[PDB]
Amino acid sequence: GVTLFVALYDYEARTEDDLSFHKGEKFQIVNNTEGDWWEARSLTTGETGYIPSNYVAPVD
């Protein structure tokens, strides 16, 4: 199903393992079966790291 998500809000990373992003930035979800921090790849930067799951929603 849909594994592409979009940021609903801007986010500035605290720790090195988090991605910073802007509203509208898209992500390919790598793993969301762990906690509420999801592993994801930014479609803008190509980087992979962790994002707060309640900041994103599926693109469709």
Expressed in angstroms, the distance from the first to the final Cα of the chain is 10
Tell me the DSSP string of the chain: ---EEEESS-B--SSTTBPPB-TT-EEEEEE-SSSSEEEEEETTT--EEEEEGGGEEE--
Identify the experimental approach. Answer: X-ray
Resolution in A: 1.7
Give the contacts of 52 (CB within 8 A, at least 6 positions apart). Answer: 11, 36, 37, 38
CA 27 to CA 41: how far, in whole Å? 5
Q: Give me the sign of the Cα torsion angle 50, 24, 22, 25.
A: positive
Amino acid at 40: A
